[PDB]
From Swiss-Prot, chains A, B:
It comes from Homo sapiens. Residues 1-89 are annotated as: Self-association site, tail. Phosphorylation extent changes in response to cell activation. Polyubiquitination in the CH1 domain by a SCF-like complex containing ASB2 leads to proteasomal degradation. Prior dissociation from actin may be required to expose the target lysines. Ubiquitinated in endothelial cells by RNF213 downstream of the non-canonical Wnt signaling pathway, leading to its degradation by the proteasome. The gene is FLNA. Promotes orthogonal branching of actin filaments and links actin filaments to membrane glycoproteins. Anchors various transmembrane proteins to the actin cytoskeleton and serves as a scaffold for a wide range of cytoplasmic signaling proteins. Interaction with FLNB may allow neuroblast migration from the ventricular zone into the cortical plate. Tethers cell surface-localized furin, modulates its rate of internalization and directs its intracellular trafficking. Involved in ciliogenesis. This is Filamin-A. The modification N6-acetyllysine is found at residues 11, 17, 49, 63. It is linked to Periventricular nodular heterotopia 1: A developmental disorder characterized by the presence of periventricular nodules of cerebral gray matter, resulting from a failure of neurons to migrate normally from the lateral ventricular proliferative zone, where they are formed, to the cerebral cortex. PVNH1 is an X-linked dominant form. Heterozygous females have normal intelligence but suffer from seizures and various manifestations outside the central nervous system, especially related to the vascular system. Hemizygous affected males die in the prenatal or perinatal period. Filamin repeats lie at residues 1-88. Homodimer. Interacts with PDLIM2. Interacts with RFLNA and RFLNB. Interacts with FCGR1A, FLNB, FURIN, HSPB7, INPPL1, KCND2, MYOT, MYOZ1, ARHGAP24, PSEN1, PSEN2 and ECSCR. Also interacts with various other binding partners in addition to filamentous actin. Interacts (via N-terminus) with MIS18BP1 (via N-terminus). Interacts (via N-terminus) with TAF1B. Interacts with TMEM67 (via C-terminus) and MKS1. Interacts (via actin-binding domain) with MICALL2 (via CH domain). Interacts (via filamin repeat 5) with SYK; docks SYK to the plasma membrane. The chain holds residues 2559 to 2647 of 2647 of the full protein.
Amino acid sequence: KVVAKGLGLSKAYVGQKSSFTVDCSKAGNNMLLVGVHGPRTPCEEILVKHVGSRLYSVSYLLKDKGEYTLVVKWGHEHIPGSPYRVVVP
Amino acid sequence: KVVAKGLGLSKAYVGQKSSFTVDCSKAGNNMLLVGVHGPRTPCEEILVKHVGSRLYSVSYLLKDKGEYTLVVKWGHEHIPGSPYRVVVP
């Protein structure tokens, strides 16, 4: 009952914040875990903000071209669509 | 082989950013995940930054008093000390 949306689920660009949301309004009081895995150059930054009504706005910053793995877990289980493949040109 | 350090592992105050570091320099190329579980009001913000050489800075922001659980995982296993109990006055 958790739903992710946004451009950052699939794309990011060097040096620019990529954004997506995770809507947990229809879920309970569990723990959200978000990470972006760069197997060579790590993700530079990731920010997860609760903006109200159990909507979370996520922004992350990548430094290098290539494929990254975006993981979004709710109670330690992948939300639908996770793990996501993120491509940086 | 991951080591976390800092006051933010055990102390946080409403409205004030709480910080710690996570040293993954002696670990491999696995994935790092950080969560702050409030049984009630969610964590407002969590910011994770790779500061270089596989050291990471973490800052988080809470909006209500109470007991929180801070989770730091490396390849989906808890790092030593995780889960951390954080009591906000």
